[PDB]
Scaffold this active site. Sequence first.
Site, PDB file in Angstrom:
ATOM      1  N   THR A  64      66.273 -13.565  -8.139  1.00 37.77           N
ATOM      2  CA  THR A  64      67.391 -12.693  -8.487  1.00 37.77           C
ATOM      3  C   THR A  64      66.941 -11.221  -8.445  1.00 37.77           C
ATOM      4  O   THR A  64      65.780 -10.952  -8.303  1.00 37.77           O
ATOM      5  CB  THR A  64      67.959 -13.066  -9.892  1.00 37.77           C
TER       6      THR A  64
ATOM      7  N   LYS B  84      67.564 -13.613 -16.295  1.00 39.36           N
ATOM      8  CA  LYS B  84      66.147 -13.383 -15.975  1.00 39.36           C
ATOM      9  C   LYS B  84      65.520 -12.137 -16.624  1.00 39.36           C
ATOM     10  O   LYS B  84      64.361 -11.880 -16.429  1.00 39.36           O
ATOM     11  CB  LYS B  84      65.987 -13.364 -14.454  1.00 39.36           C
TER      12      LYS B  84
ATOM     13  N   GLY C  92      61.414  -8.697 -17.035  1.00 35.26           N
ATOM     14  CA  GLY C  92      62.192  -9.275 -15.957  1.00 35.26           C
ATOM     15  C   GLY C  92      61.306 -10.069 -15.005  1.00 35.26           C
ATOM     16  O   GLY C  92      60.277  -9.584 -14.575  1.00 35.26           O
TER      17      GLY C  92
ATOM     18  N   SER D 269      65.563 -10.223  -4.474  1.00 40.02           N
ATOM     19  CA  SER D 269      66.279 -10.298  -3.193  1.00 40.02           C
ATOM     20  C   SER D 269      66.935  -8.986  -2.858  1.00 40.02           C
ATOM     21  O   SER D 269      66.859  -8.516  -1.736  1.00 40.02           O
ATOM     22  CB  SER D 269      67.360 -11.384  -3.264  1.00 40.02           C
TER      23      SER D 269
END
Lengths: 180, 180, 180, 180, 180, 180, 180, 180, 180, 180, 180
Positions: free
Chosen positions: D6, D39, D51, D130
């Site tokens: 993520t 996350k 994170g 990403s």
Amino acid sequence: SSFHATTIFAVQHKGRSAMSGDGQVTFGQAVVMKHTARKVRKLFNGKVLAGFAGSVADAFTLFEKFEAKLEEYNGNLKRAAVELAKEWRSDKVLRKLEAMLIVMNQDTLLLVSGTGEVIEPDDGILAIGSGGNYALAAGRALKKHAGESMSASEIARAALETAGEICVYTNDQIILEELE
Amino acid sequence: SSFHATTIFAVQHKGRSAMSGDGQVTFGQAVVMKHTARKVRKLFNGKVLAGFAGSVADAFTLFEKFEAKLEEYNGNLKRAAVELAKEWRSDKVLRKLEAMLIVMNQDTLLLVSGTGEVIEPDDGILAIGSGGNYALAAGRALKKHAGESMSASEIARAALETAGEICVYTNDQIILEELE
Amino acid sequence: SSFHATTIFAVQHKGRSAMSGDGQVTFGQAVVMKHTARKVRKLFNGKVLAGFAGSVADAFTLFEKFEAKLEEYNGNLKRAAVELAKEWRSDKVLRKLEAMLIVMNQDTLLLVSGTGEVIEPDDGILAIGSGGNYALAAGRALKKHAGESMSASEIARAALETAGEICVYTNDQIILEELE
Amino acid sequence: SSFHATTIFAVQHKGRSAMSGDGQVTFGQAVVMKHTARKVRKLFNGKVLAGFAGSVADAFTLFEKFEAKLEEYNGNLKRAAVELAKEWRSDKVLRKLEAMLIVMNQDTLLLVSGTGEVIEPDDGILAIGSGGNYALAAGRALKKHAGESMSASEIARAALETAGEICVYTNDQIILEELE
Amino acid sequence: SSFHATTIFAVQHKGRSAMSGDGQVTFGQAVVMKHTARKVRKLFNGKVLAGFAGSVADAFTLFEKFEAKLEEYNGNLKRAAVELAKEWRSDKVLRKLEAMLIVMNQDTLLLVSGTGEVIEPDDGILAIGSGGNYALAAGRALKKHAGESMSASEIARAALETAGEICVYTNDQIILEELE
Amino acid sequence: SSFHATTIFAVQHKGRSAMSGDGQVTFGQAVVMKHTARKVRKLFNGKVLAGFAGSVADAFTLFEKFEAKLEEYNGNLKRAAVELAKEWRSDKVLRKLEAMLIVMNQDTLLLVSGTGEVIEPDDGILAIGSGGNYALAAGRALKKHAGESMSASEIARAALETAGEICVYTNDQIILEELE
Amino acid sequence: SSFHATTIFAVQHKGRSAMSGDGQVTFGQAVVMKHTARKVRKLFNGKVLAGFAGSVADAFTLFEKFEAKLEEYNGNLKRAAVELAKEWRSDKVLRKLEAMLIVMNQDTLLLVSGTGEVIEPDDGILAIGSGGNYALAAGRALKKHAGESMSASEIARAALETAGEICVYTNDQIILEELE
Amino acid sequence: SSFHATTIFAVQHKGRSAMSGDGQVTFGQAVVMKHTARKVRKLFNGKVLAGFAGSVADAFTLFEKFEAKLEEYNGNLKRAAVELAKEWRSDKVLRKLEAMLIVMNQDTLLLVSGTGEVIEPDDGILAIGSGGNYALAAGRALKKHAGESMSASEIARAALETAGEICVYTNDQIILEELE
Amino acid sequence: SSFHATTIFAVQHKGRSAMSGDGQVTFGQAVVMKHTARKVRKLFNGKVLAGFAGSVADAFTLFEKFEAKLEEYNGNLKRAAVELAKEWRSDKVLRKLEAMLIVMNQDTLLLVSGTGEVIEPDDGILAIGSGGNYALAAGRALKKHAGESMSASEIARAALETAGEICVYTNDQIILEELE
Amino acid sequence: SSFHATTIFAVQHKGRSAMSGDGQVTFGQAVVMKHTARKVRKLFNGKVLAGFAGSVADAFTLFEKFEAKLEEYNGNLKRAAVELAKEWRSDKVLRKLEAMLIVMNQDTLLLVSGTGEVIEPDDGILAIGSGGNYALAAGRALKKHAGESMSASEIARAALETAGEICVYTNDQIILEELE
Amino acid sequence: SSFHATTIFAVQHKGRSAMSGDGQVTFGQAVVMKHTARKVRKLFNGKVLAGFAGSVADAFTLFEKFEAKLEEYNGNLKRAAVELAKEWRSDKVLRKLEAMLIVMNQDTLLLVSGTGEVIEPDDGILAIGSGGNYALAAGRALKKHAGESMSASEIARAALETAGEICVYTNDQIILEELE
Ligand code: NA
Ligand code: NA
Ligand code: NA
Ligand code: NA
Ligand code: NA
Ligand code: NA
Ligand code: NA
Ligand code: NA
Ligand code: NA
Ligand code: NA
Ligand code: NA
């Protein structure tokens, strides 16, 4: 592996839990060796539905391990799942598996992986295997636009039928288990 | 291309000719778009059977070139085949095709390819397409060990049935044609 | 090319015809440049629906070639398509396009491709593009198990909605066109 | 793995700290299984923001190790981070992870990787995952050119929104944490 | 080629039109051969801004071709753009270019590609080239979240500054054109 | 091509010329389509033996052409071969063929290729095709260590039998022609 | 490795046993470093012949392991070989060697391999190494059609001679050993 | 590695022994990092010449290892060489080296490799490294055709001059050792 | 790894020793994460300069291993470097690092790599990293042709400047350390 | 092609010209079909020596073209050679040939290629083909260090012998021509 | 092609123009065929210097095409270069050349490529060829840091020297041309 995963679908709907799966075992690109494999089972005295799409040696290894964590943690699905993931991703042999695991009980639905994921869906549906994405799309749709006139078993069953009909790797020998 | 050939089987057996084909149209690795394709037809006034597993526009380009070659070499199947093969493989685009052609009349059975092959089997059987080798295995087996009890059409249908049962790219929507 | 095809879904249900598509234009692996593309249109005086997910320059060439074919065969969708396919597969340039065309009048639904395929579905549904197979699974499912409480346009829209929700290359900016 | 990381963004701006992250869990090329992942977390009694875009079994192994280093080196973010790197990179399994870790307290901001990197940014911003690069460019632009009219949390949420809009792997289900 | 595209950004904002571009020309993986390249020009008596990030021999062939289509269709950006694309995608040589074209007049902004794309953005912004996506995220972030206090040329410039700061293929030698 | 060449062997021995060949037509890696193909023939009123291991369309094209050169040059094998080679290597279609050609008459034995080779052996033996090297080795050996008690036909025949026995791509349906 | 295996040929004929091999040691694609290597030897008091075409360090390890196996099973070649194969395929290093071993006493001929094969031929001939299949074709042929006028040693030598003449990796520096 | 082996040549000629080597150390495809590397040393109280063209950490590990085997087996070059090879080919790290070793005393010359080769040349000459083959051809040519008027060290030097003159990886900074 | 090495350059010129490096930390192909990294440090009490562009956890493993070798070998730089090389090349993980080490004292300058290379240059200059080969070419050129008018620290500074100007992976945030 | 070029060597030494070449015709990796090829010829009434390692249809097309240029430019070797290059390289077919051409008269020596190269050597020697590089190094060594005791023809034959001994693709069937 | 480009370097410094190149012609990976090639020439009556490292047949096609463009555009270097670029990039064969062109007059210096690039540098230096990037780094460094004490011709000479010293593909046989 030259063996293709079979296809498994799972859904919680109106106090009901079901898990459906087809039986097609394909070796290589194209050759079907078996039509009726059983890749969905009950664990923990029929309180949990488990689906693993890979080989039986890996299915049993993972089912036994998950059973032991369930006893060690008093039926808590989420905790037993997280600890399984941790073990799975550190095991030199099992970690590399492509096939994922779905476990569910009365309350919740979980996807476990060998890279150590534990994922809870947002709409009570998980799908895995060769056909999984097609069954995912078919169930999501059924539950949202035809939920009221169909149950968890009619949905698990239809999702897999739709997927058999478009996925060359999924067939129509559907096995279906529910929690009561 | 991303569309798989359907499966075609042909057999000459005890004076009878038959051709069969499934209808499974698969796009990409795994996605079925049609189930009832027809790729087996009668040409040249119901006197030949032709089977072509690729796309329709190539089917018509080839079938027309074949008709013209026949009405040129007086119905001789062997010669028309050879000459179609000569022109097919010298065509910049068509010669790249993977799909092969089967033509048959009362006397003879031929495979034609875009690399210029013309092949007349030794055992009265030809098969092409995704499942073609499984249909070839099934039909050869029936013809040799159960030929006395099956007709050309029975074998044609039975070979496709076996092929569909084991090959993911071949289904059970069989279309069959016979001469006479 | 680097540009992904948008997603288009087509359906005949209860005498009604509909065609939906999204508007996501993605460049390369992950970069969206536009959200509201229009890849579904009416042709031949609002009597047919055409969806092409490729570029505008190729959409115009093919929509104009099909227009010529329609007037040259008097509204006959199937004969126009077949002649379009032959032309498309002969053309040095357009023949390589991965993207496909769906055409539909009030009678019938066809898929046409640069390899020269022309396919009519068996259950009145076609879908193409990035999210096509998800939309095809969502639509086939809703028609079989919720057909008696959903129309053609409601299905079209729900199949595109299902597809956008699971496919990263399909968004929620839906365009829908129908025939009366 | 087949699961995509993520997107996570972190920023220190005018004495405030804030970290944002989306919820999209994509598997394989294009298939979203979850829309609302978490996350981004708080550790060490709400003094640090962490994170980690990866799997949860991995994210827990790292949050545990880091907490153990933070108490050994008495809240010293850099000392714990460097010792985390050493340990991470000498771990036969976790060392291979593509997923990186961002950690921050009220004083600084640090990226840590399984290769053993420990990077402090020059401008108060890190982003990963990403969509990380799109968040980074959005975040940096806002900080430099709009920084007197936006706070850390405002920027954090805006950088992730911008990233969600252009990146197919990042959605709009934004989780935001700040150091009160 | 071995030469990388420079970077180009365009934006329409409060009645104003601006186009910015860097000057870095990189050969192979890593060697910078020029720093002050100009790839943003005014065409059509200072009424249109055009940007093309590939080579000069191509940028002139396209600018000439585009300007002819404008004189032929009396200032109609959209029409000339489509005819450009039609021509470009059928050209044996130019069809293969990776680099894309941006054209904008007072009323609209357009991306043209050699695969025949013509795309109008939804939000007034296009960017292309090596660093195009970073400039796109930056400029989009600026316009939405700091649009009421920034001008079109102020955004074009800032989006390129950010792009240069994070992308190795984009430098800080900025060229800026605007239309009143 | 997916079709494997068959295997051809040729030999001059004690005033005798023979040419043998097997009949196995293999498609793909492993599937035999025909067992008895005939790939050795007589040309020029039985004065020459020709062997081409590829498709029949290519065999006939090359045989016709070689026949025409033989008439144009009054039976001179060497000259007709050289001119064929020249034509063959310049023809856009035929030049790319993998299969080679052997021609022989009373006096000499020649190997012609599509890259334009014309090769006269040093010991009166040529071999081509999938099995050619094995047959080459078997003949060379027979002729040198058992020449006196075996003829040109017994040699061509044994060389091919040895090759059938070790090459999976060569079979035992041997066709044999001799010049008298 | 870059070093090619030499060529070794073995034959039982008329109660006699022989084993030949060449001496060409080639490094890389084409560079000969040595012409007269000795890769055939006698073992277990001149009662068995062993050929191994790999390196000397691997020849010694395997010739000594086989010696142990022979004394530990009292001369029984087959049981020694099978135990050698099990050991060889279990060994982390030697298991990867492409080169194979031929062993033969006066009763029988065996091939042993690092994958754990043990093969006894059907016609009393084995061959291995670079030129092995040519020597195998030359030998099989001479035994069938010239057996009654050649001995075991004459065949061994002629099969190696044939192989050297056609195979670039096999020379004329022949070593021959026999049993009485 | 990215570092290329330097070049080394050895020759025995009229009772004399010499070993020559260049000094070029090249990194990657084309960058020269040193020109005067010394990879030829005397070992065993100036009785043996050793040359290893790979890295220093490897050349010392091998020279030490080789010199131990010499003290242990009392000057026996051949024996120590074989034991070196045995050890080397079973070493987890050193077994993978491309670079080879040359050792020679007054009586003999030997190439040792990490795959376990031990090779004595037939003609008194070995050469290894980037330019080894060019030096091998040169030195062989000198010894055979101009041997009666050239010395061993005069040949070692000349063979390296030639190698340097034609091979980009071999320079002209020559080191020369001899034994009386 | 997806993190590129910074650029490092060392030089000894007229009895002064200098080492410079840029600060650019690039992730993946093109994204700059940090601009002021410090990869050049003073060790062993201000007596040696050390450069390593890789990660800080490897930097410290290596900078600890190296101290430990200097003590073992009494400050003898070349010996410690050689022993560092031996242990680096046998380490299962570190063995695989692309980043190389430069160490230097008052007297000597070495490059060490994890493949076991230890190189002392011939002209007093080493360079490593992304832009290393550019920095090398610049410095060799300044030293040789402008040497009489530049100091060691001036050259190190001017070499890194040159490299940053041409190499997309090298920037202008230069760190310089000297030894008296 | 699958056919390997033969080895050709040319040399001018003390006013004498000479060209040598072997006879080996190898097909595929390892299979020799001919031992005595003739690829070295005389043209222009014995005033020039031409070597071409390729196929004969190609070698004739080049010998013809070159002869036509030699008479057009009145024996001027360089003018004919340059015009040959131009024509060779602009030929859609022959331009792709790997096989190069050596030509010489009493005054000079020139390599010509289908890429359009025309190279004159600095030291009176060219060599080409499979074994060309080994012949070159042998030839050059002999010329420079043994040139007062060998003539051009002596060197030519010796360089090819040396090459035959070390190169698996070059044999000892040497054809030699000189300019009387 | 298997022939590497020579190295070429041009510079304008204090009103003088210079261009240098080495002479190394390398074939394949490593074999040097010529050492004194001339790829730098004077054109257009001593007024322009031109550098092209490719073959002489392309050199002349290009050097003719370029004269023809200078006449067309009245000696305007930039215009001729731009028109050369357009025609070079559309030529079916020349389009594919790796070698680039440098042209220069009294006033300007351009690089032209067959992909249609025309680049005028910002600091008066271009370089191309195998060693181009080294020659570039050297010259930029001499010009900027030692500029006040070197002439254009000195820099061109010293840049090529530097490049030859580090690049295995560049040698020390330098050709220098100047313009007043
Ligand atoms: Na199915
Ligand atoms: Na099936
Ligand atoms: Na989506
Ligand atoms: Na998105
Ligand atoms: Na930059
Ligand atoms: Na067989
Ligand atoms: Na040989
Ligand atoms: Na050299
Ligand atoms: Na830079
Ligand atoms: Na040889
Ligand atoms: Na050099």
